[model samples]
Target: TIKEMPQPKTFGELKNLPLLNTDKPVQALMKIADELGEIFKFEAPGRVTRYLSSQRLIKEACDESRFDKNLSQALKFVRDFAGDGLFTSWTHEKNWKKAHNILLPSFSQQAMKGYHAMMVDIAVQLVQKWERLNADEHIEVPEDMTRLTLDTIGLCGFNYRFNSFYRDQPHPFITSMVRALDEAMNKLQRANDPAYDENKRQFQEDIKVMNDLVDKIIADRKASSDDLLTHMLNGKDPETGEPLDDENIRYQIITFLIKGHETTSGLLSFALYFLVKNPHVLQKAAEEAARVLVDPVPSYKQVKQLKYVGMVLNEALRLWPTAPAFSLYAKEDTVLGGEYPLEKGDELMVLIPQLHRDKTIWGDDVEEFRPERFENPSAIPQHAFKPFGNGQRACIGQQFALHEATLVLGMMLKHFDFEDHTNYELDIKETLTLKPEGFVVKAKSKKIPLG
Candidate 1:
């Protein structure tokens, strides 16, 4: 081994903000990471946003003893809307603790089984709608994936129905949420725009649009139900024995609406994009689903058997970690990689896309689409492959998201064939989440449907 490891390398760019404003930051940062080696920094003024792509460095960051998740710049913007809920809550926030404990059971494997029927119903709505459309239709993959996830989360989380499949256009809530989300992202990059201040009133109104629906969701609760709203309403923290208050419940609802389905939609979108491009992978996925899901709708028992399809989902996440980068800061002054020193409040961003492609971990052919690599979860190196995120602060709804994706992806593949008849190259559209832009797929229903 080398006697010396180099210190963190800094990037020299004239006015980082102006350059990044014209270009997408993440892709640029991925290129930066590669050029600067695993551990790098972008010094902006007197401050810096450090990035780590090496598995060794990431492994150190994952150790909760050294670093914990900070509410990153994006979360700060999101907090203005969602406020003190799981995704936006500070590591030290008490409500995060209470809500996390109360909702943890709802994401449990046992709980997922209860929600499986609801997930299947929404997915059925998606497939039925797809089946009704003409074969010549240019089935927009992301839109349909969004519908499936939003409705599934709505049904399974709050026992409410967005009935996204039934409508030609998304609900007003989605319109406002997407705008607010985009606005949140847009504002994040522009630093301080006079337009944002002028339109700040419009932003507040959009927040109310989401709030009104969430309020109804809270008020609509029967005081007792198995879904997430009821869990927030009635479920008490096993640690503290406290229930989420009404406003706290409201934030949790909005947080769930925004957090639950957004990334899953992107995940499905990218997976479908990859599948259409790699028909052999798609054929294998469909075959696995065909063998496992014998019934019209997959029983929870059958869904679990879709191991190969699950692998496809993993590989998709590897390429486009829909949630993308998550940042963490050390609680106190510390050293990283036993070399680079960090200040108490200095933030470290983990670019999942870069880490997922580590040549040492992933080997050559790192950029290719291959589900076979994920066939054995045990084979994945320690903290090297964290698409969902890391440690205790990781996505609470991980199982819920994966199960929904595997099931929905299975249903879509088993019943239809996806072909991207367009010469559409991959262009990622990012705003806190990532999706394939202008991506389109053609679907032809299977000649022999399941009996």
Candidate 2:
């Protein structure tokens, strides 16, 4: 007969509890938070994992009295999965302070100006493609957005052109990267599963292809260009004055390519999905875009003036954050929310969805697709809305992503009218990022003349 496990109290006893298994991990986390309150602990074999859902606790862990230690095991797995790049190494070796400082200028406003025309040209290509489709004809929004983002990152980040929009099938590099990321997610979700061995082998093979491609790209760009890749290769550790090696440089290249491509694509995809569902919101955004965007392709300054477009994007991020959950490790014993005492080396998983939709913070309309909530910035509490995250470790490309997304949205909205043909409920699939599953939309041109 099977034996029933007793309730767990201590860390030792918690190990006996069954693993919290679910395909819908975000929802599962939400249910746990509801029943067990803002802070709770669970077990996975020898380790005890604590989850924090309250904004106050999350801010403490993320900002204020920040948790400095890297979640070494988790980051190590990602590093191994991706061939040990700077993103993983920096975190594990606590080299982020130096690395971040060196790389900060790459994503600065002045640097962004150099890439604006290229970004606008890409947006025009997307618009031209959509113009060909007949009214109410279905388009795979996520797929197209993915291609656009991949192509954009290829040009801006590395000065390489994937020509993703022109091709019917994805480039081999994209195929390999996607498969590798999928396997990585699988390893994270089912660490001890018997299938992990096969997953690991496939992951390694795929990542090898990706790394090899990056090496080739770097070799081709040895005669430096004004791009993020060149910046990374040229950047040095502020303290040590050491330049990054080829392998380290390759890792940073792959990091920006994948992270920049996937997250921005997911943001655009979700924004399109949400806008289609709420036509009034879409109309308001498009109207605002029409008012601000006098040029066929908006300049950086003009795109910045797209207030309503920004609101819709912000709302979409709130509902479906690209990097949904992140963990912070306590370097030493610290009290969370000024109540729960956490020991050194303790890990806290911040459930972003729960915190984002907290009733006390966001009120009864928390679940609604209301972009107006962001209109008045002061009304919301500080650290309440963290799509890109908080503190020094927040996304380096935050403004870049927002500007690119806003420009794309403004241009698309101005030139085309979109409708939701699928009428499907939001079915999210989480890999490294959260994405809408099988989302589709139909577009009709506005027949507006360009400047």
Candidate 3:
């Protein structure tokens, strides 16, 4: 039974809650969140109220842009104008729908089948590497898993090889892109801090690396005869009826790289952590995997039947959503949850960590890692438990992400057993994404299926 009640009437009241001591950034964010929670009522903290009000304005911008109606172009816009909120500005209506619609087609049944096949192939390679690591007993799961997704997305989305996983050393582009993304996230954390020159330099450097990589990819795709990039580059925009411009093509490539690699990496790492922490839940997942996916190489069709696998992923996401928060600047005065008023220039911060754990929607079991909660989540409020967000602006890559997570978890569980480290602690870092500060885990191969 999940505990309910004790609604946070204001942002300031949030300070009384427990704070996660992941790192400086997480602490800072917790402080801000507490303050917001104390002031987040229908009427109070005039300025804070304004910030809450802006969410509606931003939603309207999403609606107007028709941003999610076209997957490739919408992702391009997200890539090109991620920091600038170009698509957010273009779509004056709830941006969630457009982003949702755009991403939905990309994950069509046929596309998912193709992606699932590629992921299985990649997982086999990963297992081979994992087997080799028994000698050293040390494997960098974060980078290793990220490479898998990067390669998978490249093959399935862009139809080209980034060759991120098959090298003795990390690719220059891949290494640089990771650093640039981290820097960009750091910049976001200090949004209210007055460090003008440093932030500017960091932003410039990050954009240069990302844009350069994207441009090169686009150029190569244009020159090539086949590949997912070429398909997107040559494809017509479903809404505007024009072929995606070269810039837009490059942007979509960038979008796939970030969402495809970073978010999946976060989900995979946390899922492993959560499963190991809850032995009961882990056992349930393993039983389901062994029973449903008995084959060494399960078919894409078989993945849908892994009900417990889906539940574990859902629970993992509920605990540690990849992108814990999203920000949007308001376009006009509006209302939210049917009451709170908003004004332009206010940033709407939707934190999934808080919402997922909110006792009202999830029950006392909110803190418990219960996969069964998702099996019938209809009782959960409409917008509560939004790991991918809500409204039209939800994540477009949800399907690809779910498929990758399922494949990775299914393979790992079938080949190995895992345990939670007694000394293990999450060192959370909050940048553009919420990541474990020292995300390490312990596990060993299982000769037989676990009950």
Best by lDDT: 1
Tell how far residue 195 is off in model 1, in angstroms: 3.8
Q: Which pairs of residues clash in candidate 1, taking residues 3 or more apart in a chain or in different chains?
A: none
Off by over 4 Å in 1: 1-15, 45-47, 191-193, 222-224, 447-451
Task: Record all residue pairs in model 2 with backbone atoms less than 3 Å apart, i.e. clashing.
Answer: none
TM-score for each prediction? 0.94, 0.91, 0.78
**Model 3 lDDT, full chain set:** 0.59
Pairing residues by index, what is the TM-score of model 1?
0.94
lDDT of 3 by residue, 165-190 (tens): 57867666666565655554444323
Better of 2 and 3 by TM-score: 2
**Number of the top TM-score candidate:** 1
Give the higher-TM-score candidate: 1 or 3: 1
- Per-candidate RMSD, Å: 2.6, 4.2, 6.9
Compute the lDDT of residue 15 as modeled in candidate 1.
34
How big is the positional error of residue 285 in model 3, measured in Å on the Cα after superposition? 1.1
lDDT of candidate 1 over 352-407, digit per residue (tens): 99999998999999899999998788988898899888888998988999999998
By summed lDDT, the worst window of 10 consecutive residues in model 1 runs over 1-10
